[PDB]
Amino acid sequence: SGISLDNSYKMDYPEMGLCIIINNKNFHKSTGMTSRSGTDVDAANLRETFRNLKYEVRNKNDLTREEIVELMRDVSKEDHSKRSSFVCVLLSHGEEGIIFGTNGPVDLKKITNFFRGDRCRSLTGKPKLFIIQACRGTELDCGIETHKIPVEADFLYAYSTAPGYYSWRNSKDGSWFIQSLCAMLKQYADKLEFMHILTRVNRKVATEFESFSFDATFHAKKQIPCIWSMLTKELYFYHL
């Protein structure tokens, strides 16, 4: 045949792949973690958004740290040979490098390691997307007025907030980041490469949101998400 190029992931496998959504709203009393009002809005928005991208969505609610690890292990042991990609969305409390089960923390590294190039062979060379709405610390952004392959390759971490910072969630509308992500996927998934979609998410969160609080410490604060890409190709959710 004619000249060929290989700059974008193959996304025309029979299935787009799994979209695992872990929605932790209510936490064991002994942890002292507050309930995450608005997270069900996020979880429903994500389910619909990824449904329309033809992902096989599985929603899981209020999982312990043990249940999170067992779920990820079991999912990583499935046969993904007929699937183009893998998506995991984590909605919970967190700190840098950590997301919380209902009864205590899980290292993000522990979760993603199940999907390493050498440990999930049916996803080797396929994009593995982790979307994280969770705090990464307690900093607040005040704003300013205006061949082998590496085992860590082909991961993308779409973080809601910069390293070290809180992440903002509205109890009525959902989280700033998930709201914006679903809106941009809805509008641009048939149009733009994924990094360009996430850049528009960055701009939407950065420009359209500002916190309102009766507490001066938490009032008038801003947020920027953080795209961490170890992908090796362009990612389009559509195919020719």
């Binding site: 009002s37 919970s92 709405q133 969770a134 903002w168 969630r169 916190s211």
Partner: peptide
């Protein structure tokens, strides 16, 4: 608005 709440933080996670």
């Amino acid at each position: 608005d709440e933080v996670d």
